[PDB]
């Protein structure tokens, strides 16, 4: 199937950061919200892998900013977990759900706090991230920061409560 094949190619181009190819495939008619076997869209993969320019052009061409994959992850979860600050900012600008819950109730703030991404924690907080959000263990982002020895983030979350 032609259309499905274009989607597959778009997913791969977004995954590996081939910006010109992403643009060509969109012009060919590739579905910007094509999904792979794991429910990831091109925006998920570009966000996860730090491809900012691709993230921008996908959003400009109708990508679902709040697409959800097989384990409940949104592009914002992926950018936050992987430390891509600029991508976090552009996703939020485009209406990303700041408190979306992935599997086990994990929010983007949980993941940024866990992974030690201070600047991302701060931007999430500015956009209304829920400091009191509990995962299915009962852990807040503060608890994850503490668990991982990220005391600067723990202090920030403490004073943000």
């Amino acid at each position: 199937h032609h259309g499905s094949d274009l989607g597959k190619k778009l997913l791969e181009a977004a995954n590996v950061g081939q910006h010109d190819e992403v643009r060509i495939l969109m012009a060919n008619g590739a579905d910007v919200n094509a999904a792979d076997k794991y429910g990831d869209t091109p925006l998920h993969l570009a966000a996860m892998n730090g491809h900012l320019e691709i993230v921008e052009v996908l959003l400009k061409t109708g990508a679902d900013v709040n697409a959800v994959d097989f384990m409940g992850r949104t592009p914002l979860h992926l950018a936050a977990d992987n430390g891509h600050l600029e991508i976090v900012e552009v996703l939020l600008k485009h209406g990303a759900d700041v408190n979306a819950q992935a599997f086990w109730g994990k929010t983007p703030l949980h993941l940024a706090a866990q992974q030690g991404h201070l600047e991302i924690v701060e931007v999430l907080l500015k956009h209304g991230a829920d400091v009191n959000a509990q995962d299915k263990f009962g852990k807040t982002p503060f608890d994850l920061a503490i668990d991982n020895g990220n005391e600067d983030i723990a202090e920030v979350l403490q004073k943000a409560a």
Partner: protein, 164 residues
């Protein structure tokens, strides 16, 4: 002149499920550096179903790298609570009903729980978690697996084919 023995049922028997679970968990434990040497999961898969699950679990873990390893590390587990915690995570995974993707996730989680158990000096749990996986597959998930074409269908979907 060799006459067939029409044996009665042995409810606890589950040889194919046990071999599949043992292969995948053994493969993953060696891959993560928690087990070395001979035993199930060492060397190439000797059954296309086992190869299919190794490949499916590997590909899943590449996409969701720390999803289950984080969960297994964060989960409070002692030998006395392990079955309860295993059941908790499995039941959550299968909210919304089984599908092949959730089955793969279930295997990945089970292996992750085994790895964390070895890491926490609770190696005794490895064999126990394998058996809990077997019981869960043979009872909770069996009807869905059968109605969906059985493990032969899984092998067709996830395996590397007749040439390999």
């Amino acid at each position: 002149h060799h006459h067939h023995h029409h044996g009665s049922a042995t409810p606890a028997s589950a040889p194919d499920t046990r071999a599949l679970v043992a292969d995948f968990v053994g493969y993953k434990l060696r891959q993560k550096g928690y087990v070395c040497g001979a035993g199930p999961g060492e060397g190439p898969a000797a059954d296309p179903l086992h190869q299919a699950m190794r490949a499916a679990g590997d590909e899943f873990e590449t996409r969701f790298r720390r999803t289950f390893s984080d969960l297994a590390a964060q989960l409070h587990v002692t030998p006395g609570s392990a079955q309860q915690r295993f059941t908790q995570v499995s039941d959550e995974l299968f909210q919304g009903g089984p599908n092949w993707g959730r089955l793969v996730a279930f295997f990945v989680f089970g292996a992750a729980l085994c790895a964390e158990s070895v890491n926490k000096e609770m190696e005794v749990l490895v064999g126990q978690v394998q058996e809990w996986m077997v019981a869960y597959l043979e009872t909770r998930l069996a009807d869905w697996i059968h109605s969906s074409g059985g493990w032969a269908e899984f092998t067709a979907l996830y395996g590397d084919g007749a040439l390999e």
